[PDB]
Amino acid sequence: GSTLYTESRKLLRSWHLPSV
To answer: Where in the cell is it found?
Structure first.
């Protein structure tokens, strides 16, 4: 669910730290 999906995106996108 987006609600939780979006939150996860923030966390996930957090790791992606290195956009390299």
So the answer is: Host cytoplasmic vesicle membrane; Host cell membrane; Host cell projection, Host filopodium
